[PDB]
Symmetry: D2
Subunit: 237 residues, 4 copies
C-alpha cells in the first residue's frame, strides 16, 4: 500500500487511536499512532514554523515547531530510513478536518536533500523554495481539496469565500520531481524541510492537523482518510 | 511546434546551414542558425566546462566554454526571454552524431533558477546538482539514445558496448520538474547552468555537438533531428 | 584616496554637483557624480529592496530598487571592475544626512560572491545573510554613527531616543572579512547583494541617501563627507 | 585559556595519553584526551574527505572521514555546544608533526553556519568555500608554519622545497570573520564543514594529525603544542 514517513502537527486529540490528550507533534512511521510525540501549545490564528531534519550518520529524524516569542516543541526518533522508504520518494504536505475544522494554510515551504557518494567532492543535491504559490503552480501535484494562488498561499483544505474552513476536507501538495532520499553508496545523505503555516479555527476545537510526509512516488490520498487520519493513512492501526 | 532557446557547443561545420567554418559555440533562439556565435577550439578527449547565465534586469543570455589551462570561448546575445518562452518550461541537455561522431558524455550538470517577486525577500528558487548519475535516474526524462549510469556519467548519445561512439545517434536529458522561468510580477528573475563534458571522436571530423536548452514542457526529439540538428530542431531554417 | 565603486539611493537632488532634479539611483565609479542615474520614486516611510548584480562575462553592474506594488527603478553601467578595484576589497553600506535628515535603516542584507578558476568545478565562494542585527554584531565593522541591535535593525545614521533622525550624520557598516572580488585565472566571477531599507523623514525633504559600496579593505569615512557626499567621497569632483 | 572543541584525524597513537593503539578520529572537548574515538584506516598518500556536522536540536556533533571507494569511519558525541563555547567563535584547521612527520595538505575547505532566531523566517547564515588557495589569502589567519598558494593548496605544516615534511612543526588556518555559533534566542542553529586532505609520510610512521576546531576568537597556538598536542592544547590533561 503506500509507505508513509511523516511529522504531524496534530491539533485534535483522538485518545481512541492513541493520541495524547493535548495538541502535539509526533513522528509517524507507516502508522498514525506516532512512535514518538511531544506537547505543542498551538496558537490559533498565529503564523508558526516547522523545521524537520535528518542525516544518515545520526539516523535520527527530528522536528522543531514554534511561534515567535514562545517555547518550541521538539520531537526526535532514531530511524534508518533506507530500511523504511524506497530510495526514490516524493515529499509533500498533507492536511485534513473532520467534524471540527481549521484553516491549514501554508505560507512558504522549502526543502533541501543532498547525497554525498564515496567519490571526492561529488554531491548530488535538490533544493526548492516557495515563498509565494501561484494559481498554476506546475511543479506541485495537488490532491484532494488543495488549492494555491489564493493570496499567494497554499490552502491544503477547503476554505469558503468568506474565510471559514470546512469540515471533512483533505488536501495534499507534493513536489513534482522524485527525490533520491537515500543511496547505498553515499557516505552522507541528508535533508531538511521548513514550512510556515497559519492554522485558525473559528471555534473551540480546531481539527485536524498538518503533516510533512515522505512517500512512494505514486502516493494518493487513501479513501476515508479525512479527520483523524490526516489524509495519510487508510486505517488507524 | 516546440519553442526552443538553446546554447550549442557545435563541433562540426555545416556551412550550408550557416555554421561557420570552425567548431563554435552559438546562441540559438528558435533556429539551428545561431543568432550569435563565437569560435571554439574544441579539444578532443578533454573535459570542458560550459557556464550559461541570464537575468531579467540585463536580458542578455551569455555562455562561456573552457578547458583547464586554456582559452575560454564566450558568446552573448541580448534577448527578453519573456517574449520567447512560456513561463513554465523544462531545461535539458541535447546531443547528436550524423556521419561523423564523438562521445557526448556529461559528467556533471547543475542549474539554479530564482524569481524574486515585488514582495521583498519572497524568493522562489529551484536548484539541482548532479555530479553522479545513477542507472535509474528517476528525476531525468531521457529521450532518444541517452543512458545514465555508465561511469556514473550521462551518455547523451550511443556509444558501443566497447566504448566507441556511434553515428546517427540523438539523445536528450531533461530535468523532471517544470521550471517557472519568468513571472509577470517578478522584480528579478535569473538562472545559471553549468555542465562538464567529454567529447572524444575517434575521427578527424568530430560531430555533431552538445547543447543546453530551455523548451516547452512537453518537448520531444523532432523527427530526423540527427547530426546537424542536434536533436532540437525539426528542420534547419 | 580610497577606491570606491558605489550604488547610491540618492534622496536629495544637489543639482549643483550633477544630481538629477528628482530622487534617483546611480552608479558612482570613484566620484559622487554618477556615471549613470535613473529616476526613483522614493516612498517615504515604506520598506524598499535593492538588488545589485555583476558578473565578469558581461562586465555590467546593474541595480534595481523596488517597493511592493510599484514599478522599480533600474540602472546599469558597463564597467570592468578588474580595472577599477584591487582584487581584495571590503563591501559595506553607507548613509548620511546634512541640513535635512531621514532614518537610514537597514532591515536585512545578504551578499554572495563566487570566483571560478580555470581548473574545473573549483569555485571559491563567500555568502553572508543578515535578517536581524544584534547589539554585538562581531562580524561587522561599524564606522561613524552606525549602530546595531535597535529592534534588530542596523541604523546607519543617528536616530535619537524618541525616534527622530538627526542632521549632519554619517555611518557605514562593512563586512568583517575581505572579499576576493576578482582574480586573473578565473573564468567567471560574480557577486550579488540585496538589502531592505526603511527611509523615513519628518521634514519636507528627506536627505541624503543610502549607498551600497565596494572599497579597498582599509577604507574609512572621508572627513566632512556628511550630506551630499554620502560618507563615501572627500569632495564633489 | 582557549576553549577548544575539535575533531581530530589522529595519525599517531600516543597510548600514554589515552590514544587507542591505531590511527583514529575523535572528538576533543577541551582536552586532547578524546571524549569519543573511532578506528580510522588511514591511507598514506591518498586524498581523503572529512565531514563534520552539528545542530542544536539533537546536540550531537558527528564526523565521517572517508577515502574514495574505501569505507568510512564515523564518530559522534552528544554535547551541548551552547555550554562549551562562547557565542562568537572562530573556526579553523590545525596540524602538527613531532619526532615523526607527514604532509598535512588541505586541498579544499567549506563551512556553513545557520541560526534562526525568535522572528519569522529570520535566519542569519555564513558560508565560505575554498577549492583553491592563493599565495595571499587575505580572508584566512595563518598561524605557526601554515602557508597557502603552494600548488594552490594549504600546507598546515613545514614541507621543504622538494616536498618532504618536517618534524616539530605546528600550523593553523582560521577563517577571518567571527562566526555566531549560538544565540539564546534561536529556534535552530547548525553548522557543517567539509575539507579534503592529503597526508603523506615518507618516513613510514606518519605523525601527528589534522584537526578541525572551533575556538574563542583570539585563540593562538599553545607554546609547546607540537607532536601529540596537535597545535591545540597546552598540555596532555
Ligand atoms: C469527533 O470525531 C470526528 O471529528 C474529529 C475532529 O475533526 C476527527 O478527528 C474524527 O476523525 C471525526 O471526524
Ligand atoms: C556529412 O553529413 C553527415 O554527417 C555530418 C557530420 O556528422 C552531419 O552533420 C550531417 O547531418 C550528416 O549526418
Ligand atoms: C544645504 O546643504 C546641506 O544639506 C544638504 C541636504 O541635507 C546636503 O546635501 C548638503 O551636503 C549639506 O550638508
Ligand atoms: C617521540 O615523541 C615525539 O614524537 C611523537 C610523534 O611525532 C609525538 O607524538 C610526540 O608528541 C613527540 O613530539
Ligand atoms: Ca489527532
Ligand atoms: Ca554543425
Ligand atoms: Ca544628492
Ligand atoms: Ca596522537
Ligand atoms: Cl566639496
Ligand atoms: Mn497524533
Ligand atoms: Mn552551429
Ligand atoms: Mn546623486
Ligand atoms: Mn587521539
Amino acid at each position: 500500500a503506500d509507505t508513509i514517513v511523516a511529522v504531524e502537527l496534530d491539533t485534535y486529540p483522538n485518545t481512541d487511536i492513541g493520541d495524547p490528550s493535548y495538541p502535539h507533534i509526533g513522528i509517524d512511521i507507516k502508522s498514525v499512532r506516532s512512535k514518538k510525540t511531544a506537547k505543542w501549545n498551538m496558537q490559533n490564528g498565529k503564523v508558526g514554523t516547522a523545521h524537520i531534519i535528518y542525516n544518515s550518520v545520526d539516523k535520527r529524524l527530528s522536528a522543531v515547531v514554534s511561534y515567535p516569542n514562545a517555547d518550541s516543541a521538539t520531537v526526535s526518533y532514531d530511524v534508518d530510513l533506507d530500511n523504511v522508504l524506497p530510495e526514490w520518494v516524493r515529499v509533500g504536505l498533507s492536511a485534513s478536518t473532520g467534524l471540527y475544522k481549521e484553516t491549514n494554510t501554508i505560507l512558504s515551504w522549502s526543502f533541501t536533500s543532498k547525497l554525498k557518494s564515496n567519490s571526492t567532492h561529488e554531491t548530488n543535491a535538490l533544493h526548492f523554495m516557495f515563498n509565494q504559490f501561484s494559481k498554476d503552480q506546475k511543479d506541485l501535484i495537488l490532491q484532494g481539496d488543495a488549492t494555491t494562488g489564493t493570496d499567494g498561499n497554499l490552502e491544503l483544505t477547503r476554505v469558503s469565500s468568506n474565510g471559514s474552513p470546512q469540515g471533512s476536507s483533505v488536501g495534499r501538495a507534493l513536489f513534482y520531481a522524485p527525490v533520491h532520499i537515500w543511496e547505498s553508496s553515499a557516505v552522507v545523505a541528508s535533508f531538511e524541510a521548513t514550512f510556515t503555516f497559519l492554522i485558525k479555527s473559528p471555534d473551540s476545537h480546531p481539527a485536524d492537523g498538518i503533516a510533512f510526509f515522505i512517500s512512494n512516488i505514486d502516493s494518493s490520498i487513501p479513501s476515508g482518510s479525512t479527520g483523524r487520519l490526516l489524509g495519510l493513512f487508510p486505517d488507524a492501526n
